[PDB]
Every structure is written in C-alpha cells, then in structure tokens.
Amino acid sequence: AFRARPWELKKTESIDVMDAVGSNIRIDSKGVEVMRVIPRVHEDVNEEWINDKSRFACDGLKTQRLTTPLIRVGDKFVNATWDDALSTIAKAYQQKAPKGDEFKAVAGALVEVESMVALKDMTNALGSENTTTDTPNGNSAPAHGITFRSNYLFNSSIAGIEDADAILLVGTNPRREAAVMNARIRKAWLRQELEIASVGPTLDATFDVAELGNTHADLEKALSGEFGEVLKNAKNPLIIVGS
Amino acid sequence: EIVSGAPAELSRNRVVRIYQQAKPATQSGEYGTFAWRLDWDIVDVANRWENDLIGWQSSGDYMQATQMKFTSKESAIKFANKQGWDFYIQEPHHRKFRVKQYANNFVHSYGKLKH
Amino acid sequence: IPEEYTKQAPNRDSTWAPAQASKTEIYKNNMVRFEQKDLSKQPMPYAGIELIAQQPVRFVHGNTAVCDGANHNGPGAQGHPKIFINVDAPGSHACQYCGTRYEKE
Amino acid sequence: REIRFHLCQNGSSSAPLRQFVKNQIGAFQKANPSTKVLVREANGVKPIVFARFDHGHESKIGLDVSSEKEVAERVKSLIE
Amino acid sequence: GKTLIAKGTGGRSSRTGYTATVFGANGFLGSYLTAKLAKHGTTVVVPYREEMAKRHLKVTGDLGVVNFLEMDLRNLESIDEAVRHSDIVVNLIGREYETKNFNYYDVHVEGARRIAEAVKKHNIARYIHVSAFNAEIDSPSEFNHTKGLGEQVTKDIVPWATIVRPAPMFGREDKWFLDRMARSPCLVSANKFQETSNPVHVIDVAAALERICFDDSTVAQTFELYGPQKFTQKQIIDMVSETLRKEVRHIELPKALYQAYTKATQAIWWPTYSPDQVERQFLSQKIDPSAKTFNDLDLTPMELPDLMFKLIRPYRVN
Amino acid sequence: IATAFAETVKFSGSKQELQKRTLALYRQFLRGAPTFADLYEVQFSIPTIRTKIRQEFERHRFVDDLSIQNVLYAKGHMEYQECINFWKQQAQFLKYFPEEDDIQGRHQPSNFVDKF
Numbered sequence: 001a002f003r004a005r006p007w008e009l010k011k012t013e014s015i016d017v018m019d020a021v022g023s024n025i026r027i028d029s030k031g032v033e034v035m036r037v038i039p040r041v042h043e044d045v046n047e048e049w050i051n052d053k054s055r056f057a058c059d060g061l062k063t064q065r066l067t068t069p070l071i072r073v074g075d076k077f078v079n080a081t082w083d084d085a086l087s088t089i090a091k092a093y094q095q096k097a098p099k100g101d102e103f104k105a106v107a108g109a110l111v112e113v114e115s116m117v118a119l120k121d122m123t124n125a126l127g128s129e130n131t132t133t134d135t136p137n138g139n140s141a142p143a144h145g146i147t148f149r150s151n152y153l154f155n156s157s158i159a160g161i162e163d164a165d166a167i168l169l170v171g172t173n174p175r176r177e178a179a180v181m182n183a184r185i186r187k188a189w190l191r192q193e194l195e196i197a198s199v200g201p202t203l204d205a206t207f208d209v210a211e212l213g214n215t216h217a218d219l220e221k222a223l224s225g226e227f228g229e230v231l232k233n234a235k236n237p238l239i240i241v242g243s
Numbered sequence: 244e245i246v247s248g249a250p251a252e253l254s255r256n257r258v259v260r261i262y263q264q265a266k267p268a269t270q271s272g273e274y275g276t277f278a279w280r281l282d283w284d285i286v287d288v289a290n291r292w293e294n295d296l297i298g299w300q301s302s303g304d305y306m307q308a309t310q311m312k313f314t315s316k317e318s319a320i321k322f323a324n325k326q327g328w329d330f331y332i333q334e335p336h337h338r339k340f341r342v343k344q345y346a347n348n349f350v351h352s353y354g355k356l357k358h
Numbered sequence: 359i360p361e362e363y364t365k366q367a368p369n370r371d372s373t374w375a376p377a378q379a380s381k382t383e384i385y386k387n388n389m390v391r392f393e394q395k396d397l398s399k400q401p402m403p404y405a406g407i408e409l410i411a412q413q414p415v416r417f418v419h420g421n422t423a424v425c426d427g428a429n430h431n432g433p434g435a436q437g438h439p440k441i442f443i444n445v446d447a448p449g450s451h452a453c454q455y456c457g458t459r460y461e462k463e
Numbered sequence: 464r465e466i467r468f469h470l471c472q473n474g475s476s477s478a479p480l481r482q483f484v485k486n487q488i489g490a491f492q493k494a495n496p497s498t499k500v501l502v503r504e505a506n507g508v509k510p511i512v513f514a515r516f517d518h519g520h521e522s523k524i525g526l527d528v529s530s531e532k533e534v535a536e537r538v539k540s541l542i543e
Numbered sequence: 544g545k546t547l548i549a550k551g552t553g554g555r556s557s558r559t560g561y562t563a564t565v566f567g568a569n570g571f572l573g574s575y576l577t578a579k580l581a582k583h584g585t586t587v588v589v590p591y592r593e594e595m596a597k598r599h600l601k602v603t604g605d606l607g608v609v610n611f612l613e614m615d616l617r618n619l620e621s622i623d624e625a626v627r628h629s630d631i632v633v634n635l636i637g638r639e640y641e642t643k644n645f646n647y648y649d650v651h652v653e654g655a656r657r658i659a660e661a662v663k664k665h666n667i668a669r670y671i672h673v674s675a676f677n678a679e680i681d682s683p684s685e686f687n688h689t690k691g692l693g694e695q696v697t698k699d700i701v702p703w704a705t706i707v708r709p710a711p712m713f714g715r716e717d718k719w720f721l722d723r724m725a726r727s728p729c730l731v732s733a734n735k736f737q738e739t740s741n742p743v744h745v746i747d748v749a750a751a752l753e754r755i756c757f758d759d760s761t762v763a764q765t766f767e768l769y770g771p772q773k774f775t776q777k778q779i780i781d782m783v784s785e786t787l788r789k790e791v792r793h794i795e796l797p798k799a800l801y802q803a804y805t806k807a808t809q810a811i812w813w814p815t816y817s818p819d820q821v822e823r824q825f826l827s828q829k830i831d832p833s834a835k836t837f838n839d840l841d842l843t844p845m846e847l848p849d850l851m852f853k854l855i856r857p858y859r860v861n
Numbered sequence: 862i863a864t865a866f867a868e869t870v871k872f873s874g875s876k877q878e879l880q881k882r883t884l885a886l887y888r889q890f891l892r893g894a895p896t897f898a899d900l901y902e903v904q905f906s907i908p909t910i911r912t913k914i915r916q917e918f919e920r921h922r923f924v925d926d927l928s929i930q931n932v933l934y935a936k937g938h939m940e941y942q943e944c945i946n947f948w949k950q951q952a953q954f955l956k957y958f959p960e961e962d963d964i965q966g967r968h969q970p971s972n973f974v975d976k977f
C-alpha cells in the first residue's frame with residue numbers, strides 16, 4: 001500500500017514462477033526486500049497480465065525464509081554451521097551407504113533448471129537414478145515418453161489459441177491453473193466462434209463450456225460421439241489436458 | 244585485448260546485461276523504449292546486505308547502480324566487446340497489430356453480451 | 359541472544375507497537391551499546407495512534423467535509439492541502455492527512 | 464544407462480538422424496527396455512549422439528553423415 | 544556460539560556479528576589485535592581506564608565496531624556490565640610493575656578471577672586469557688609466580704580457558720624490548736649480560752590471537768608462542784647496534800647494587816624498571832614441551848633482523 | 862614552458878621503435894629503484910622492487926596493437942614521472958605492493974568447497 005514510490009526501485013527483469021506458462025514479470029526491488037511485481041509486456045506469452053497468485057509472492061517471500069541450515073536433534077530443531085551440516089550429511093551417507101538404486105531425490109515444485117541439472121548429475125554420479133516429482137503417486141512414467149519433446153508440452157503456440165476453431169479441455173480447470181491462459185481463452189471466445197467443452201471436473205469458467213461427464217467412459221463416448229465430427233470438421237482445433 | 248583504463252578485474256569476472264528497457268505496464272507512455280541499457284548484475288556475495296546500526300543497505304558492489312544509455316544495440320555491443328567484458332543481450336518484445344473497429348458492438352445469434 | 363534486561367521503558371505513551379513491523383525490543387535493537395546510558399535519551403513521541411483517541415469526532419450535516427488543519431493565527435497556509443472527504447457511510451471518518459474523524463449528522 | 468540424442472530440424476545434416484529416429488526408437492526401447500532414450504531438440508544445432516553409462520560416465524560421438532545404416536553402427540559403437 | 548564460513552573476508556563492513564570484548568587494549572598489544580578485529584566487521588567492547596588514551600583505537604573501524612566502557616577491576620559491577628552482551632572475550636591485562644595501588648597479586652589473579660567469574664556467570668563462549676612466558680609457580684620472578692597463579696585460577700573455574708603464553712614481543716613502541724634499545728640512555732642491566740631467549744613479532748602475536756579467537760575445536764588448549772628460529776640472547780643488542788649509533792652501552796652492574804634504582808622506581812611519576820623485570824633477566828624461556836604453536840594454528844611468525852631493519856629505522860645517523 | 866623530468870608525448874609509428882623506447886623506459890624505471898627505496902623507506906629490498914617491475918611489464922608482454930602500446934607507454938613513463946620525485950607518497954606508493962600475507966588470516970584456498 002504505501003511501502004515505496006517508484007524512483008527508489010531497482011526495477012528488474014525476471015521470469016515468473018507458480019505457473020507453468022513462465023509469465024512476463026518485472027520485479028520492483030528496494031534492495032533487500034521485494035516491494036511488488038509488475039507484468040512486463042511480452043506479446044506471445046501472456047502479453048499484459050499476471051496470474052493473481054504471482055502478484056503476491058512478495059508477501060510470501062520476506063516472511064518465513066530459511067536463513068541458515070537447520071538440523072534436528074529430534075523434535076528439537078536447532079540451527080547450525082554450514083560446514084557442520086555438510087559433514088553431518090556426508091557422515092550420515094557413509095553410515096547408511098545407500099549405494100544402489102536408492103537415495104530418492106525428487107523434483108520439487110518451484111526450482112531452477114540448473115539446480116535440477118546438479119541434482120540429476122549428482123545422483124547419477126553417486127550411483128543411481130530415482131528422481132520423480134511432487135505428484136500423488138507419479139512414481140512412474142508420465143505415459144508420454146521423454147523422447148520426442150513435441151509429445152510432452154503445450155506444443156501449440158499460445159497466440160494460436162485465438163486461431164483455434166474449437167477446443168475441448170479434459171482433466172483440468174484452466175481457471176484454477178494458468179489463469180492468463182484462461183484470459184486468452186475468453187479473448188478468443190468473445191472474438192471468434194468456438195465450441196468449448198469440459199470433460200471431467202465440474203467447473204465454472206467464464207466462457208460457456210459443455211460438461212460431458214466425470215468419467216473416462218464419458219470421455220471416450222464424447223470423443224466418438226460428436227467431437228469426432230467437430231474436431232475433424234474444424235480447422236486447427238486443439239485438445240488440452242491437465243497435469 | 245587488454246583494458247587500458249579499467250583498474251578492476253570486472254572484465255573477467257562479471258556478466259553484464261544489454262537490454263532494451265521494458266515498456267512499463269502501469270503508466271502509458273513509452274520513453275523507456277528508446278534507449279539501450281547496460282547493467283551489471285548482482286550475482287554476488289556482496290549483493291547489498293543489511294546494515295546493523297541504522298539499517299541502511301550498505302552494498303559491497305563498487306558498481307551497483309550504474310546505467311549507460313546507448314543508442315543502438317550493435318553500437319552497444321561494439322562498445323561492450325571494445326571495453327571487453329562478458330555480456331548477455333536480451334531481445335525486446337513489441338506489441339502486435341490488432342485491427343480495432345470501434346464498432347465491435349454488434350452481434351448475430353450468440354449467448355454472451357457485454358458492455 | 360543471552361539473558362539481560364532493564365525494565366524502564368515500554369513502547370511509548372501507547373503500550374504496544376505503533377504499526378506493522380515497528381518493534382520495541384532492545385536485545386534485537388543491539389543492547390551492546392545502551393549501557394552506561396540514562397534511558398532518558400528521548401522517548402518523546404507520544405504515538406499519535408493515541409492522539410486520535412485524544413481527538414473528538416466532528417460532525418457535518420452536509421455530505422462533503424473539507425479538511426485543512428491550518429491554524430487561525432498563521433499568516434501563511436500551513437495545514438495540509440484541501441482534501442474533500444466523504445461522510446457517507448459511518449466508519450469512513452478519516453481525513454488521510456490528519457486523522458480527524460468526520461461523521462455525518 | 465540412458466541415451467540422449469538431440470537433432471536439428473534443418474534438412475541438411477539431420478535427415479540421416481531424422482529418418483533414423485522416425486524408425487528406430489521402436490528398435491531401441493524394444494532393444495533396451497531398461498535403458499531410457501530421449502530425443503529433445505528442434506532448433507539449429509550439431510547432430511551429436513550422447514550416451515551415458517549407468518555410473519555418471521558420459522560418452523558422445525557426432526553423427527555427421529551416412530544416409531542411414533552407419534548412424535546405427537555409430538550408435539552401437541557408442542553402446543560399446 | 545555458531546557462525547558462518549570462516550574468518551578472512553575480502554571487504555570491510557561485510558560485518559561478522561561476533562561481539563568481542565578486549566580488556567586492557569589501550570596500550571601495546573591490544574592495539575594490533577583490535578586493529579585486526581575491527582578491520583573485518585566485528586563489534587568490539589573495549590573498556591578503558593584513561594579517557595585520553597583510548598582515542599586512537601577508534602579509527603580501526605567505522606561504526607558500532609568500537610565502544611568504550613568505564614571498567615575498573617575493583618568494581619565488580621563494571622566488569623559485570625562489560626560482558627553482558629559479549630560473545631567472545633580476551634583479557635590482555637597486567638602491568639610489568641606494581642602501582643601505588645596494586646599488588647602483583649590481583650592484577651592477573653583475582654583481577655583475573657573476577658572477570659572469569661563474570662564469564663562463568665554469563666556463559667561466555669571462548670574465553671582467552673593471555674599469560675606471560677616462563678609462567679611457573681616458582682618464586683624467583685614474582686611476576687611469573689603470579690602469572691602461574693593466574694593460569695591456575697583460570698583453570699580452576701571455566702574449562703573454556705584458552706591460555707596463550709607469548710614470548711617477549713617485538714613491535715613498534717616495544718615496552719621494554721626496543722624502547723630500552725631505541726631511546727636507551729644507558730641500557731645497563733642484565734647481571735647475566737646475555738642468556739635471554741625467544742622474540743616474537745607483535746603483528747604475528749596479533750595474528751595468532753586472531754586466528755585462535757574465532758575458530759572452535761581449540762577450547763581448553765594452552766598455547767605458547769615461540770620465537771620463530773633464533774631464541775637469541777642480548778647479542779641482538781649488537782644487531783640493534785648494527786644501526787650506526789652503537790649507543791647501547793651495557794655496563795653489567797652487580798645484582799644487589801642494581802636493586803636501588805628499582806626501589807627508586809616506586810617513588811617516580813612514571814614507571815621505569817621494577818625488580819621483577821630484573822629477576823626475569825636471570826631467567827630464560829622455560830619452553831613448554833607440549834603447547835600448540837604457530838605451526839598448529841597455521842602461521843609462520845617473522846624472523847628478527849630483517850624486520851628489525853624496518854622496525855628501528857627512524858633512528859639512523861645520516 | 863617547463864617540465865619536471867622531461868616528460869615527452871610523441872607516439873612513433875613503427876612497433877620496433879616503440880619496442881626500443883619502452884626498453885629505455887624500462888632501464889630508467891629499473892635504475893631508479895634504489896632512489897625509490899631511499900625516497901619512500903620501504904621495508905622490502907631493492908630486488909623486490911625489481912622483480913615487481915619485471916612483473917608489471919610481463920603483465921603486458923602479449924598486447925598486440927601498437928596503438929594500445931602507445932598509451933601503455935604513456936602510462937608507464939608518466940608513472941615514472943610521478944615516481945622519480947616526491948609527488949607520490951608512501952601511502953600512495955604501497956598500492957603496487959601486496960606485500961604481507963598475515964593481514965588476511967586464513968582465507969580462500971581457491972577451492973569450491975571453501976567458497977562455502
């Protein structure tokens with residue numbers, strides 16, 4: 001509200017977190033504290049907007065950060081010297097000796113690629129590979145291979161979403177995740193004529209979906225029933241799936 | 244290349260940033276579009292700590308707050324290699340043409356209506 | 359960081375903190391160098407949080423309340439500039455320059 | 464072990480790797496179900512095939528030119 | 544007390560957070576260690592006794608890194624106040640002479656016992672107590688007798704007792720190692736006119752005390768700071784008279800005849816050459832076989848003569 | 862309308878001539894070393910001065926352009942000019958001499974582990 005005033009502020013280019021879209025943020029900094037964020041302009045990816053969660057990481061930053069390494073005696077949780085904690089970790093590793101097919105590292109939510117490269121490289125250097133993600137029993141392949149990158153991600157352009165004739169969404173609530181993707185959805189839906197249907201979760205999103213069940217059998221029914229006509233008939237359709 | 248008048252060991256150590264200054268989203272107005280900016284990063288241990296007596300922020304970077312204002316990106320980068328330190332350039336991002344009929348206030352058969 | 363205290367001062371005339379993140383503990387405030395010192399170095403702010411409760415609420419039967427704060431002895435303009443505030447809902451009695459409370463009656 | 468080979472999508476210097484990888488991934492995972500394959504690049508790079516053995520040990524070779532059939536020979540050499 | 548990476552940083556005001564307290568420190572040794580200590584961002588409570596002598600220790604750091612308290616070893620409350628807030632504490636203390644109000648006792652025994660009792664009452668980690676070379680429990684220099692008693696008392700209570708025993712020191716404004724060489728109207732003493740021992744340079748003493756005062760894993764060990772190589776006698780006077788004036792003029796007087804000047808010394812405005820110094824002239828470095836040194840704390844202290852070339856060179860002829 | 866120790870500014874063209882000119886500059890800059898030790902009263906010896914002067918010129922052995930070597934020659938001859946008399950003072954003069962180690966304590970052994 002009144003914390004700063006924009007000439008004190010080392011306005012700094014950065015990349016968003018807390019959304020997979022990598023939005024176009026710019027950080028207002030007073031030098032130690034982070035004051036606020038401003039969505040910079042980036043015409044492909046989320047041209048003018050921020051996810052509303054991403055606007056208030058500032059109050060989520062300077063509140064309870066880990067400032068020092070902490071070790072447990074056990075239900076008694078004291079901070080300690082850096083080198084002490086490092087030698088404790090190495091000594092505990094030498095105690096357990098988890099040589100083969102063990103030491104389960106796991107991809108956290110909000111990290112950088114370079115830390116994950118160090119993670120994978122250190123685990124494979126240590127002797128095994130066990131790196132999974134946060135997901136509730138995704139201790140298994142994501143059922144689309146790491147081969148052929150195009151299979152993996154949102155491989156249509158974000159701008160081309162408003163070039164799509166009719167799309168349908170499955171297993172997701174795109175208001176709940178990537179809200180600026182929802183903004184481009186509504187931008188297209190007011191611009192053009194799009195037949196939109198949700199399949200799966202019951203969602204109130206502001207572009208008139210037609211929900212067609214909460215079951216896989218309802219999904220396969222809706223695919224073979226009438227969207228087999230629509231998506232084949234339509235010109236550049238898209239089909240978006242949740243994580 | 245040896246630096247002639249740069250007494251620091253800046254030229255081997257830091258990453259500098261060539262960037263177009265972004266168009267601010269709060270105000271409309273676009274004077275920051277027409278520069279090019281040189282900025283040293285804070286990728287440091289010095290990196291603006293906190294004081295303990297009054298509580299300013301005494302930095303350790305001898306060149307924390309410094310901005311050139313250049314004219315052209317290639318003139319910027321010819322300077323950047325001429326005085327010779329490691330850079331990274333960053334491409335700006337424009338705003339795309341979209342035809343705006345002010346008359347967008349008309350419909351066929353369609354559910355949603357607006358102001 | 360250790361055990362030492364000198365019970366001679368609260369925050370102000372007001373007992374607790376004045377706002378968000380304005381502490382009154384002295385150990386975090388570097389108790390190393392308060393020693394050999396009177397404590398009669400100046401705790402003089404009376405914490406104007408208390409001084410609006412000093413102030414009585416003013417009533418205006420119009421709808422728009424002017425606020426100046428300027429005296430009626432000064433030859434020059436000295437109060438805060440002329441903000442017009444609204445008295446419409448009860449509660450919004452707050453001139454954001456002075457804190458004088460203006461209620462509609 | 465896991466293998467990794469990343470491809471430019473220019474027509475020159477990648478059409479051997481292209482018409483390899485449009486055919487032989489079903490040869491690889493059904494030849495090596497434990498060994499994990501990944502192919503991940505489009506933009507302008509050099510064709511290099513990169514294996515890593517199961518204990519932190521890299522290996523590479525460039526995959527310059529053979530219309531097919533020596534691409535797989537150099538791959539099998541990288542397994543060896 | 545727990546910390547971060549190491550001692551030696553690369554820039555002033557990149558401050559540590561270590562809150563030290565150094566006793567004495569107005570005079571000779573305590574200049575250079577707080578000069579090394581405030582240089583690298585540590586809060587120093589330096590108490591004092593004379594207002595006009597405490598000033599030249601302020602410029603070592605800028606802000607909050609030098610502080611003055613009005614201690615006095617008579618007053619319990621002053622020392623009690625002095626290390627309430629401290630984190631580490633060293634005491635270099637003890638004149639080389641009795642005052643008109645102090646015994647040799649209770650300037651580093653019960654003077655040490657008071658402050659160590661304050662340490663135990665405040666649970667101060669890393670108490671370091673300097674003590675003299677040749678610190679025996681035998682009589683002959685009651686200075687040395689009293690330093691041995693002081694080490695005994697600092698080991699009686701407070702097992703956090705890093706005792707350090709430096710040699711005769713060697714620096715700018717050497718109290719009775721080179722001021723009796725530089726000014727030296729007639730340096731005349733030493734009935735045994737040779738047969739002294741180890742010199743150590745002062746900035747090496749300060750570097751030793753600095754590298755002990757921050758690292759852990761050295762609690763309750765005792766150090767002795769040996770001379771680097773030479774352990775040399777009063778023949779270094781000849782090297783002192785290698786400078787062209789050769790005014791040193793040792794006249795090797797009898798022992799009991801030399802006492803009277805020392806018995807004159809108690810009457811004087813300023814201290815001169817009190818007789819425990821004269822008795823220590825009959826001693827040598829009774830070097831401890833088992834006490835960790837510069838090689839243990841990873842230092843090599845500098846040699847005598849080439850450093851003496853710098854250290855005494857205002858005093859040349861032409 | 863004057864000098865102080867005949868500072869001249871005229872850069873020649875050929876790199877051989879600049880070589881000879883820097884060589885004679887090195888001779889005077891080396892010859893003045895006992896005059897320096899007299900003038901400033903350093904602790905270290907005259908061979909320490911000589912090995913550090915040699916170090917300073919070996920810092921720019923492999924500089925290509927004569928049109929950089931010109932202003933390097935000017936800097937060298939000009940700091941010789943400001944050293945041959947008492948313009949520089951010893952506090953100003955010790956900025957060339959990282960002499961002592963014991964100022965630093967234990968420090969970085971240039972390992973990654975002890976950056977932490």
Ligand SMILES: NC(=O)C1=CN([C@@H]2O[C@H](COP(=O)(O)OP(=O)(O)OC[C@H]3O[C@@H](n4cnc5c(N)ncnc54)[C@H](OP(=O)(O)O)[C@@H]3O)[C@@H](O)[C@H]2O)C=CC1
Pocket residue numbers: 566567568569570571572573591592593616635636637638639645649650654673674675676709710711712718719
């Ligand atoms: N021959 C030597 O001197 C040697 C020195 N040492 C040890 O090194 C220690 C420090 O040496 P140095 O730097 O020369 O000491 P100083 O000459 O600097 O004197 C110590 C300081 O502490 C003051 N002080 C503390 N307590 C008292 C007290 N009860 N009565 C009077 N004054 C007191 C002294 O006077 P004031 O109160 O006025 O400030 C003085 O300023 C010595 O104590 C000694 O044990 C060991 C080997 C050789």
Ligand SMILES: [Zn+2]
Pocket residue numbers: 425426427438453454455456457458
């Ligand atoms: Zn007002």
